[PDB]
Amino acid sequence: TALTSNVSNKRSKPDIKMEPSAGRPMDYQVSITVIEARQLVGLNMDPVVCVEVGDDKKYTSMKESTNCPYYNEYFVFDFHVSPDVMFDKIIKISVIHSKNLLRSGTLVGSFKMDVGTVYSQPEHQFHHKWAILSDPDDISAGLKGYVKCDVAVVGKGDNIKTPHKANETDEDDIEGNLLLPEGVPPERQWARFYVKIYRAEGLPRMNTDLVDPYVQVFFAGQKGKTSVQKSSYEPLWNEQVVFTDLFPPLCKRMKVQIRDSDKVNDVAIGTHFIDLRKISNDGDKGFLPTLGPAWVNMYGSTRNYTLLDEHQDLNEGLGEGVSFRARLMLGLAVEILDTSNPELTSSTEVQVEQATPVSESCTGRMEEFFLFGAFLEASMIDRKNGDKPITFEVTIGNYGNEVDGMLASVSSTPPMRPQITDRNYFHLPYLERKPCIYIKSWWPDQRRRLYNANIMDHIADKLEEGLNDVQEMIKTEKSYPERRLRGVLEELSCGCHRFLSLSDKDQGRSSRTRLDRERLKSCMRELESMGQQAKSLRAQVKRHTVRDKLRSCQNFLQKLRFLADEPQHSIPDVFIWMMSNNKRIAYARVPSKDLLFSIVEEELGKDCAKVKTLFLKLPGKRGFGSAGWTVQAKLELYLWLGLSKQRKDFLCGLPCGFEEVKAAQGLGLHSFPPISLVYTKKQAFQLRAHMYQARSLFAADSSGLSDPFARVFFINQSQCTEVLNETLCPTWDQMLVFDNLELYGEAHELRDDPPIIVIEIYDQDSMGKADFMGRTFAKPLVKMADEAYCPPRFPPQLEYYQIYRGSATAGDLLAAFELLQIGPSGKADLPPPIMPVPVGIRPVLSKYRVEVLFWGLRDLKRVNLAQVDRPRVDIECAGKGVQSSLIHNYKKNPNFNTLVKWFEVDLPENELLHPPLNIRVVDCRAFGRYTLVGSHAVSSLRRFIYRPPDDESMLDWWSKYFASIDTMKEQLRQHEAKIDELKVYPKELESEFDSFEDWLHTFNLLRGKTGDDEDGSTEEERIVGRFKGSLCVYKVPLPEDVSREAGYDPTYGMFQGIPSNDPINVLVRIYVVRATDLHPADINGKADPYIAIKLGKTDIRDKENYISKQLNPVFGKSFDIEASFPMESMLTVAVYDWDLVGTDDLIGETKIDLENRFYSKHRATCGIAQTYSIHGYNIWRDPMKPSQILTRLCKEGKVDGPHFGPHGRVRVANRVFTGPSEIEDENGQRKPTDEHVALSALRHWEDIPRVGCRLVPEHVETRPLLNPDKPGIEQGRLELWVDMFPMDMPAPGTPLDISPKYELRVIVWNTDEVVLEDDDFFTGEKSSDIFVRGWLKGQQEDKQDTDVHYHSLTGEGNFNWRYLFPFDYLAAEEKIVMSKKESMFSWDETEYKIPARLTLQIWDADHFSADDFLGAIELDLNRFPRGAKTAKQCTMEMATGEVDVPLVSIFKQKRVKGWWPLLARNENDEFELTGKVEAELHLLTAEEA
Ligand SMILES: [Ca+2]
Ligand SMILES: [Ca+2]
Ligand SMILES: [Ca+2]
Ligand SMILES: [Ca+2]
Ligand SMILES: [Ca+2]
Ligand SMILES: [Ca+2]
Ligand SMILES: [Ca+2]
Known part of the structure; x- marks a missing residue:
């Protein structure tokens, strides 16, 4: 295999951010729509769904006397809060029976799940899922129903993909689509959630100065509170609060906070959030949630009492707490109750009882810890502070609070006056006399938690630095990032194997609590699995898939950072404050997990025994926004923390060469910590x-x-x-x-x-x-x-x-x-009054000509509330500049009269070092007062740098569309008979043709101050227009064959062959096909869609032809609208909701630009067909023929062609294409043409060498609709395609038919040979009271019966009775169409399709009971046999599979009269001749009926 890179080639830049995600409030939006409900338990109830998010609730409408209601009602909850308190906000989807303002409603059931569960989805929503309503009153009560709903969470800048909102006609299983995450069982069982609350230690002054504390604990909207230990700084409760809620809980956090019991103004002290996911694992591999008995550390406002506390919200845990408030002994135990046992009391009410007491030895030995600090420098102090001397106080726990009062320990540096650095900043003149602190604390000896978490964070930090190195090496484009990611995965595997030896050496201690056994085994299992998961990802990663596997490595990093957080705190965090003559200014926080000392490096803290650069910041809300941009102090502290019996080497991390000055208490004690250092080196x-x-x-x-x-x-x-x-x-x-x-x-x-x-x-x-x-x-x-x-x-x-x-x-x-x-x-x-940067450091510059195609300016807004009159674009790059021509009038012609003008500028040799090119429009009035109108800066020029090359008569348009849609479905199936098709595109046409920006790139224009997060504005309030044009940046000109792509005209530049700039009139021909998944715009949960189209100055709406009460409408309209390019180019196709009274409400709208579609070489004005025809549904709609298409693209392409030999072949450029030679029309004769093979040439136009392009086919594009009322959310999916034809070519023909019915008459004459049921009273043989029953679609609407021929002894009957069956028909698919409701709970009309077969039956009539079945035949309307002339001519072959009886279609013959058999099963389960009937089948149209 390929080797690994094991060195760091990048990452010298520190990613320090002063404004993290914690504490910052950002605009969250939750959107909830209850679709329907099913199987709700109750008798003649009136359900109304009550959805609460936190402190407010919003009901639906009341549905009458149904257990399966339908609402489809949308709800919007907006909250501007922090993400952590947003995720802990609970949703309370409920159902209330008979809600009214006079009496309280009775809750059928309820369901709870917080927002952070919904946000943990892969796209942050649940789609069409069913919430089980449990009973929050009885634990022995059963399932109370299901509530289908959509729950979606979207933040600022978040965009959401919405799936298909299918109706209930596409039937859904409830138990496979529930409102749960992955892995939780559907029958969630009850569980007691004990929290065991023992003792607190170290409360601050709150009264003036005593404390009267209690603990209030919140879980899943419930709460319970303990007793009050009046006048106690170290209170002892020994009480436990027991909850009773569903397991595993979908509200995955707990609040535990201390509160003062003030008689008027009770208020919090500190708050800890028990993150319930970190103390539990699901399944049989996992374990029940447990914690403690161990201490926890809680933070809030300053311990010094202020009456008007500006940080009161930090006592309630709403941000990053700025000082240590209190420390609380805590515990948690989860026990599943068996609900089937009747002796257990069935209340869910939160109870308080007395807990089992535990000694203080169970949390660990009370060893004594030593924290040593050394302030090496204190720079960058805010100028507003240092008119008085500044001290620095280090406080860990209650230790270090010697100033407030709650070895003589020192915690404050000596005060000194600051020296001025500059106009914005001070610095303290410490120089060589660094002040120092030393503290003595007493904590439990749970160092093993922090050591294991240090190994976890060491692995996570190595992995994160490696992933940042891989990302930076991809961004810089270094050689082989695959080798680097392989080396990172090797180091991750070695780190995961290293944890298995380091976290398992001290298991025999008695202080080992319950949770740090199960959690320790859990992360042993997790890193044991990751030890070869990283090695499998090592074999899986390559050069072409490094970006995809970096996401898997990010999942590994997120899992490792989930593992590293220790839910059982032992040592609190160490705080470094700055006070101006004891008035508190700014703070910082170091985790004590990072300062802990141990002898081997991975379990050693990463900030221990080294100097770290640490920036103070203002406490709480002052650190956000404009008030806290300036750094309050830039420190570099030395901090060490550990045992005092491990104090042998706590000075060796400091910079060497310092005298150690000790206090008076340490004279003669060489191991005594120093008060200050005086450096000599x-x-x-x-x-x-x-x-x-x-x-x-x-x-x-x-x-x-x-x-x-x-x-x-x-x-x-x-x-x-x-x-x-x-x-x-x-x-x-x-x-x-x-x-x-x-x-x-x-x-x-x-x-x-x-x-x-x-x-x-x-x-x-x-x-x-x-x-x-x-x-x-x-x-x-x-x-x-x-x-x-x-x-x-x-x-x-x-x-x-x-x-x-x-x-x-x-x-x-x-x-x-x-x-x-x-x-x-x-x-x-050292090798070498303003100096430049020296040579070898500055980039070497080579000259580049920048050629700009000045095309035009669109959508220009007002400057000082006055319209743009004479814009001229100045373009600047690296100081040099080119000035475009003046636009003489923006209103009539918003384009420049000179296309290409260029300027020369030296630019860096490598393209990564390039400055951004600065386009800029200004309003060029007289006398040189050129005020700015707009500017665009953010671009890379490697995008623009040139580099040199080396029955069939019933077929309609909907048959075409459905054939193409099943082709699209089978193409989806393969990736995951005579009907021609088209290319259905499931996205916007931009995303498959790079927005048609092949030469006409669009730049977005800005003006003004960039907006703040609260007091500013969006980029839609900063857009002042858009400049359309192009760039072409290149070096000294190339040899002659490459320079002939620019050598004809310096006013054309390298944009030779660009089409002309004059305005041209053009017709827009929009076809609208259908729409799917529309958003409810009325109170009934549906809308009334119609088309509204705007383009420049023309607005055309179709509110007279609305579609009533439909969320999946089929429009089928065409719109011939006149436009004047380029002024009228901005099209916005919109859907609007018709309203009987008041005003119409907007459903959605989408932006589609037609200049790029007009001027592209992709030809988006008209899609080429897949096949040629001059008749029928596959008609060629384009006025100019495919021969004209390829002559246009041949003269526009500088390509020789076309050439014709026979009509079956067409030669263009160096390639030859073939196809059929003849064309057929509706009359039926053949004639030769060249258009088929010509169309085959445009279908393969990408094979052309130089100007080879992807011409669009005839198509159905689908655009997502957007709404300004709810931006960033996909409102719907609108199917349309746009045609464009200029007026100076010949005009197009009539628009194509894309717009979205018979009656059968049956006469029953006689019967013969029918089977018999009733015994004769006088003679004894059987007989039948024969009558005939028939229906076409169903017995709900088409059930009709004849008169009864009583007492038939052989089957002979005489009726002469008539039926009627009106229906709709689809002749291409032999399907009968009817419109009906899906169920009793629906409030719409839905189209369905059935096979076109008529059912005829024979029955026996009884005067005292129901009718008795005799026989039946099912007759296809296109394949029923011709009837026999007599009853005896009818045989078994008229109903079986024998071909001896001819078959007649009723749509061609229109009247068939004769005899038919009927079959039913006898006692031997075979079909026999159970009867015969004489019938006449007749057909009429809807016009004749
Ligand atoms: Ca009090
Ligand atoms: Ca200025
Ligand atoms: Ca300014
Ligand atoms: Ca409305
Ligand atoms: Ca309406
Ligand atoms: Ca009977
Ligand atoms: Ca009878």
Whole structure:
């Protein structure tokens, strides 16, 4: 096999984000529609479905006296909350019987499932699924029914694919389509959910200052609370709260929080979320959810009491808690109750009882832990803070809270005044005197949980860094990323095999709780499986499938990160605060799992014994948005945590060469921790920040540009590159230098882990503060005084750094940073008042001609509420520019009078280093005041860079469409007789023909400030138009044969053969076929669709020909609409809901652009047919013949042709195509033509060498409909195709028929030889009261009976009786069509199809009972035999399979009279001659009837 890459070629850029997903509220949308319900238990009830999401509920309409109601009612719940509290919001799909405002309704049943279960779906919805309604009152009660519904969760920027909303005619099994996730059994059993609540320790002051705590625990909408331990900082409850809910629970979390029992203003202290998935596994391999008895750590607001607490929401767990509040002993046990046992009390009510007490030894030995801190630097402090001195306080648990009051331990650095770095930032002058802290704490000795989780996160971090390396190597396009992913999977397999030896060495301890046995075995099983799952993915991954298998590796990473989270906390997280003369400012959080010390590296924490760069941020809501862009502090702390009996080597991670200054209590004790360090090893370093060019920056000015300049932060110094004016892609070309910086430590320690550089990009304004486009972080290429400035690592080439303005990306930044150590010879050891970046670091430039096809401008919006009059497009690239011609009037002709004009500009040699090209439209008035109208920047030019080459009379259009749709279904089946077809396309026509942008690319135009997440706007409020055109970027011109593709005209450029620019009148001919899965637009759950079409200035609607009460309509209409291209090009085909009173409501609309369809070489104006004909349903609809089609494409293609020998062959270019020679019309004679073979040539037009293209066939495109009222959701699927024909060719013919019926008359004359039933009273032989029963479609509507011929002794009867059967017919398929309801619960009319056979039966009439069956015959209307002249001529061959009796179709003969037999089974189960009948079959049309 191919080898593996085992080194890191990339990932020097740190992906630090100041605004993670936690805590940020983002607009969530849940949408729920109850379709129907079935089998609901009750007697003459009136069900109304009540759907609640959290704190509010919304009912349906009341249905009368049915156990199977139908609603189809849509509900929209919008909530602007955080994702974690959105996922914990519960849905409460219920059914209420007889709901009214006077008396409370009686609940039939209910069902519960939170939002996060719905969001865990592969496309975040459940489709047409049936919710079992259990009984929340009785656990012994049975199933109370099912409720079909759709539950969908869609967020901001999320788009949803909607499946087919099939009706109940396509019958569905309930038990195979339930509203459950995968793996849960349908008969979910009851289970007691105990939570055992023992004791809390370390509560803060809350009254002024005492605490009166209790615990309130929420689960699945239920709650229970414990007693109140008044005036106790360390309360003892010893109470357990028992729930009773369905297992496994679909609300997969628990809230456990402490609350003050204030008499007026009771409020939380801290909240822990028991994530119920982490403590359980399903199936017989899994185990029941259990936790504890072990402590848990809870976080909230600051412990210092504020009356108007701005962080009160953090006490309730709504964000990332900023300080340690309390620690609570917790437990959980799940026991399945056997509901069939009658002695157990059947209430589901939450109860509180006294728990079984446990000692404190069961949670672990109370060992004492040591945390050591060292503040090496404190830079980038906000200027608004440092008018007073700043301290830093480190607090873990209650330890470190010496200032508030709740070995003499020290927790605060000494106060000092900050020194000014620049206009935005301070820095503390620590220099060589680093302040330090040391704390002593007492925690349980559950280090094994954190050690196993450290091994898990070590494997996960190696895997994630490897996947980021593979992604970056694919993005950079390095050599063979397949080898790199194979090496990553090898390292993942080695890590998974490494866990099996490291997490199993200390199983004999008595502190080993119940959960960390089952969970430990669970992750042993998971990593044991992953140990060869990674090796199978190693054999499966190759070069062509690396992107697909990276998703499987991401699944592996997500599973590993699921495994690494430890639900049983032992040590709380360590908090680092900053206070300005004790007033709290900013905070940070380090997990104590990452600071724990152990002797082998994988179970060692990743942040232990090393200096980590840590950015403080404002607490809570202040850290989001505009208030917290500026960094509150950039620290680099040293932190160590572990046993005090493991304190032998906790200084060795620090930079070397420091004197250790200890306090007065440690004089003479060499093992005493230091109060401060004083460094003595001064090392000198110099940062040259080579920057070339930022790109795609945020727009922070009203003109839509910015004035960018970058502040560079390193240690304690700051410098700026110069301000460039009105550009979002600056070329600064400026190297900054920080000279004679003083680092501390030894040289080789910072080589492989260098310090950080913060690069904040600012928008210079006229006065006051500069605006902010974000920041990026960097790690430099550090060289020493002795190593050579040599290849491959030196000189540093530039790389892109991703800038983030908080959450959203806001540009890239081309830079290379280097730390050069000033050595023994001074600066002479370093190879080299604004300086440019030096050679070898800047990209080498070769000249490129940029040729722009200035086609036109569409949909231009107002500038200063005035319409665009004279637009001119300036295009800029790397400083050079070309100016287009002026549009003289945008209203009449929005196009330029000169096609191609070009300009020369040096560009980088490799295409990855290219700047974005800057198109820009301005309003060019007199006297040079060119205000901006729009601009588009974000593009890559490798898309545009040229590189040189090397009965049959009843057939209709619907028969064609159904033949094509079964061809499409069989093509789906193979991938997962004489009727010609067409290519049905199941998507938009754009996605199979690259939006018809083969030469006419479309660029979207923007103007203005880029909107904020709350106070800003979408990109639809920033679009000011669209520029249609093209680009062609190439080097010094190629040799003569390649240069002949441009050499005819410099005003044409390389766009030789582009069609002309003059406006042309054209007719649009829209055919609408049908629509599927429409959204309910009325209160009845359905709508009244009709077509509404807009194109430029013309609006045509068909509200007089609406379709009533249908969600799957068949339109069958054609629309000949006049348009003037290019002004009237924007078509929007829409469906509208007819309303009897008030106003019509929009159903949906789709955007379809017809300029790209007009001007493409794919010919989307008219699809070519698969076969030629001049008559019938397969008529050629295009006015100009296939010979004209290929002469058009031959002169437009610069290709010789056509050439004709005989009519059966056509030669175009170097290839010869064949086909049939003759054409038939309706009269029946033959005549030769060339159009068949010509059409065969366009069907194979891709075989042409130079301008080979995929011409579209005749087709049924299907566009998804979108609604501005509910964007991002697929409203429906509308089938249509568009034809276009210009007016200066000859006009098209009449539009084709695409628009979406008889009566049989039967006369029964006589009977003979019929079997007999009733014994004679006088003579004793049998007899029959013969009468005839007949129906065509069914006995529901077509049941008709004759008079009774009483007392027949041989079968002879005389009736002369008439039936009538009206019906609809499909002559192509021999199917009778009727319209009827599906069931009693339906509220629509549905079309069905049956075989076209008439049923005739003979019966015996009784005056005291039901009729008795005698015989029957089923007669096909196209194949029933001719009747015999007499009764005795009728034999067995008239009903059996013998061919001796001729067969007659009633649609050709129209009247057949004679005799027929009838058959029924006797006692020997064989069919015999049970009777005969004389009949007459007659046919009339619907017009004759
Ligand atoms: Ca109180
Ligand atoms: Ca500004
Ligand atoms: Ca500005
Ligand atoms: Ca309506
Ligand atoms: Ca309506
Ligand atoms: Ca009878
Ligand atoms: Ca009878």
